[PDB]
Write a protein that binds this ligand. Structure first.
Ligand SMILES: Nc1ccn([C@H]2CC[C@@H](COP(=O)(O)OP(=O)(O)OP(=O)(O)O)O2)c(=O)n1
Ligand SMILES: [Mg+2]
Ligand SMILES: [Mg+2]
Ligand code: NA
Length: 337
DNA sequence: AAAAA
DNA sequence: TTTTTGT
DNA sequence: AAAAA
């Protein structure tokens, strides 16, 4: 029996149902834009379950017993079985609102609210937005337009590794006992990503040392001329754009703009932070949903709390978090829900 | 949109 | 039916 | 702020 929870499924990058999931991902994205949160999440859960299947759906009998596939979703699957295409997803791909939202939000610093604003103003192209004399752009959007081609090309493994070296070299300069772990997609075995994410922790650093590290590391990069964009969120994390010199990559202008995210956590909470930052987003949502609805527990990136026992559960590894929740251990490369 | 309360 | 959906 | 991350 397949579980409705991603945290009770093993999802690798070997997708046998991309015909169905690409259509479901488009329908979900449209519902996000139309502020239909419920319908959006239902199409995301249906897409996630199909990604876990060890075989391709070739008939409607194949969908029997699979959870998260209600009547609406089964109609979409039936249509794709019929002629290899989704008429519903095709209509979304040709919709002017959907096309504008995809194009506008492809800019770093532009989300659903700004994309909706520009569409209602009558904008349809990035050229018309950038050249407009009345529009005022945030610092994030200015960086998003300036480094657009580099950021839209995404990041490969040689680039991510080159970035890992830069992060580790900078971090150990200020905290020599610090542990730096690449998280996100790359930890789950992905070949590419929209960014490179890292978790930093130190077993001997003080409360003040822990607080100052991200400021020290980003100032160091600013001094080198490598910091293209920086936003530090106090507890603690930062959203960056780094200048990655081609010579650093072991695989034009001679460099590439790379989106990098850094997270600093207290040593004793490192397992919770690693689990939260490894992802996928769907795996994390279902872990938290399972904890709440199935175990009466509260899970977040910092802790696990048992509401019945009225106690915080400690963990030195991800394996211990899974054991507390009563879940079989899912490896990082199996969390691609 | 699907599943549970 | 209403509520929940990653507080 | 709100928005974006
Ligand atoms: N809405 C989100 C977004 C992110 N995360 C967590 C898990 C993934 C980790 C990385 O965030 P992203 O870098 O956006 O996700 P990604 O899994 O690494 O995908 P990509 O490789 O394209 O960056 O943060 C999350 O829990 N919920
Ligand atoms: Mg990432
Ligand atoms: Mg990210
Ligand atoms: Na964006």
């Amino acid at each position: 029996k397949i579980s409705q929870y991603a945290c009770q499924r093993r999802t690798t990058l070997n997708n046998y149902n991309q015909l169905f999931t690409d259509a479901l991902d488009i329908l979900a994205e449209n519902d996000e834009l139309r502020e239909n949160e419920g319908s959006c999440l239902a199409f995301m859960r249906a897409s996630s379950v199909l990604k876990s299947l060890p075989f391709p759906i070739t008939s409607m009998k194949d969908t029997e017993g699979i959870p998260c596939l209600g009547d609406k979703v089964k109609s979409i699957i039936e249509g794709i079985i019929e002629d290899g295409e989704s008429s519903e997803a095709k209509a979304v791909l040709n919709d002017e609102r959907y096309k504008s939202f995809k194009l506008f939000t492809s800019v770093f610093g532009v989300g659903l609210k700004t994309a909706e604003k520009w569409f209602r103003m009558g904008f349809r192209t990035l050229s018309k937005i950038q050249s407009d004399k009345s529009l005022r752009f945030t610092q994030m959007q200015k960086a998003g337009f300036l480094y657009y081609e580099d950021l839209v090309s995404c990041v490969n493994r040689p680039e991510a590794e080159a970035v890992s070296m830069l992060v580790k070299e900078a971090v150990v300069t200020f905290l020599p006992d610090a542990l730096v772990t690449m998280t996100g997609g790359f930890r789950r075995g992905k070949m590419t990503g929209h960014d490179v994410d890292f978790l930093i922790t130190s077993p001997e650093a003080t409360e003040d040392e822990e607080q100052q590290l991200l400021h020290k590391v980003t100032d160091f990069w600013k001094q080198q001329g490598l910091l293209l964009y920086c936003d530090i969120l106090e507890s603690q994390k930062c959203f960056l754009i780094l200048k990655l010199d081609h010579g650093r990559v072991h695989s034009g202008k001679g460099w590439k703009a790379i989106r990098v995210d850094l997270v600093m956590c207290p040593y004793d909470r490192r397992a919770f932070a690693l689990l939260g930052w490894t992802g996928s987003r769907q795996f994390e949502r279902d872990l938290r949903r399972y904890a709440t609805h199935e175990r009466k527990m509260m899970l977040d990136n910092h802790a696990l709390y048992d509401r019945t026992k009225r106690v915080f559960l400690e963990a030195e590894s991800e394996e211990e978090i899974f054991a507390h929740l009563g879940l079989d251990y899912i490896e990082p490369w199996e969390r691609n829900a």
